[PDB]
Write a protein that binds this ligand. Structure first.
Ligand SMILES: CCCCCCCC/C=C/CCCCCCCC(=O)O[C@@H](COC(=O)CCCCCCCCCCCCCCC)COP(=O)([O-])OCC[N+](C)(C)C
Ligand SMILES: CCCCCCCC/C=C\CCCCCCCC(=O)O[C@@H](COC(=O)CCCCCCCCCCCCCCC)COP(=O)([O-])OCC[N+](C)(C)C
Ligand SMILES: CCCCCCCC/C=C\CCCCCCCC(=O)O[C@@H](COC(=O)CCCCCCCCCCCCCCC)COP(=O)([O-])OCC[N+](C)(C)C
Ligand SMILES: CCCCCCCC/C=C\CCCCCCCC(=O)O[C@@H](COC(=O)CCCCCCCCCCCCCCC)COP(=O)([O-])OCC[N+](C)(C)C
Ligand SMILES: CC(C)CCC[C@@H](C)[C@H]1CC[C@H]2[C@@H]3CC=C4C[C@@H](O)CC[C@]4(C)[C@H]3CC[C@]12C
Ligand SMILES: CC(C)CCC[C@@H](C)[C@H]1CC[C@H]2[C@@H]3CC=C4C[C@@H](O)CC[C@]4(C)[C@H]3CC[C@]12C
Lengths: 58, 96, 96
């Protein structure tokens, strides 16, 4: 571990940097579809019902 | 964590449906069986039929590729050294 | 072995047909000529267009990728020694 070492560090830091893009993809979608369909905070939780489904859907 | 993001990212949900997209189609190709197959398929330098969309899953695929680029490259460096046979140790090593 | 498993596995049977079959167009694209090509295509580090779908054939796809990873890596690590030819070394070098 003492002489490879850092490729696990950038792998750990890469997955940390990825999940904030995932909420960035979530909020940019949840602000876009809520212009006409639903409201601001609720339509985020509406798509939470989509993602928590254990099945295929629309 | 690729499966967690690909079941949370609202851009991986894609319609295959190539003719003319109507409604009520979209579905992830990242099942939990499939996400190991991208992890193993990239680790073995061969690549999969799975290729991510949806930038949050691209970054996981981006950093796992650079992970397995170095591990395979570090493995082939020392492998020239460790392919030398060792003769058998003698069954005695001291007066005892 | 991959041809035996793909005809025996009930999940490699898929209907290709991306637009609404409605009865039966289910196919099993692994023939003999396709099964050798996945083996040769992974031996030469290039990868075919055909990818295993059932987990019955993923392990065959998984182990054979790990087999051809070590073959090519042991090939490249050893061939550095054989192209860098150690020259003629007639075992007299000085008066000592
Ligand atoms: C190194 C090894 C370590 C262990 C491996 C890791 C663990 C092994 C993972 C095991 C489960 C993952 C395997 C693929 C899915 C199973 C499909 C199947 O069996 O046939 C099913 C076809 O119905 C479907 O195919 C529905 C598709 C479900 C979504 C697929 C990903 C979600 C799995 C999320 C997994 C958990 C993640 C957290 C939860 C979100 C038959 O349906 P069923 O049998 O009656 O099931 C109830 C029906 N229902 C689901 C439709 C309601
Ligand atoms: C699944 C979620 C993760 C779960 C687990 C979470 C864990 C969190 C993990 C890691 C989180 C970060 C904390 C650790 C890193 C710094 C502290 C440290 O260890 O010092 C290190 C260096 O320190 C550096 O040199 C840091 C330089 C930046 C590299 C890290 C980010 C990569 C840059 C962007 C690229 C990626 C982003 C972009 C991708 C496109 C120690 O080095 P040293 O001390 O100098 O010498 C070694 C001596 N010793 C052996 C005794 C130690
Ligand atoms: C026609 C076909 C051919 C015939 C049929 C074959 C039948 C028979 C063929 C072979 C069986 C018997 C072999 C004889 C020797 C046994 C080995 C042994 O001794 O123990 C070894 C254990 O090493 C292992 O455990 C190897 C297995 C690794 C696990 C693979 C899992 C991969 C799954 C992941 C896939 C992921 C998929 C990705 C997609 C999700 C170590 O011990 P040893 O050092 O070797 O012992 C030497 C003795 N000595 C100590 C004095 C030196
Ligand atoms: C590059 C990324 C590839 C990732 C793959 C990683 C796979 C797991 C990796 C490593 C797992 C095991 C690590 C121990 C090996 C050390 C050597 C050894 O012990 O040999 C000894 C016996 O042989 C054994 O006892 C090993 C038994 C398992 C062999 C098969 C492992 C590969 C799994 C197959 C799956 C294929 C892949 C699955 C997916 C398709 C020989 O005796 P010795 O040497 O004199 O004793 C020294 C022991 N010491 C060094 C421990 C002190
Ligand atoms: C990346 C995640 C998902 C899986 C791997 C876990 C990582 C974060 C862990 C597992 C083993 C750990 C290493 C184990 C030993 C050492 C040596 C020590 O002197 C510095 C820390 C260091 C280098 C650790 C850094 C963090 C580490 C690489
Ligand atoms: C940290 C954040 C704010 C910066 C990155 C912005 C991310 C989250 C968003 C902003 C605009 C988004 C893009 C908008 C439109 C499309 C076209 C679609 O067919 C595929 C997804 C794609 C390509 C999106 C990917 C994600 C994206 C790039």
């Amino acid at each position: 571990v003492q002489n490879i070492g850092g490729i696990f560090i950038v792998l750990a830091a890469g997955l940390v940097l990825s999940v904030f893009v995932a909420v960035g993809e979530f909020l940019y979608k949840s602000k876009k579809n809520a212009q006409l369909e639903k409201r601001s905070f609720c339509s985020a939780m509406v798509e939470e019902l989509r993602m928590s489904l254990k099945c295929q859907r629309r | 964590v690729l499966f967690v993001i690909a079941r949370f990212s609202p851009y991986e949900w894609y319609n295959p449906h190539p003719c003319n997209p109507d409604s009520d189609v979209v579905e992830n190709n990242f099942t939990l069986l499939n996400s190991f197959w991208f992890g193993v398929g990239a680790l073995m330098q061969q690549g999969s039929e799975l290729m991510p969309k949806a930038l949050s899953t691209r970054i996981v695929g981006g950093i796992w590729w650079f992970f397995t680029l170095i591990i395979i490259s570090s493995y082939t460096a020392n492998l020239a050294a460790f392919l030398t046979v060792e003769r058998m140790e003698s069954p005695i090593d001291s007066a005892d």
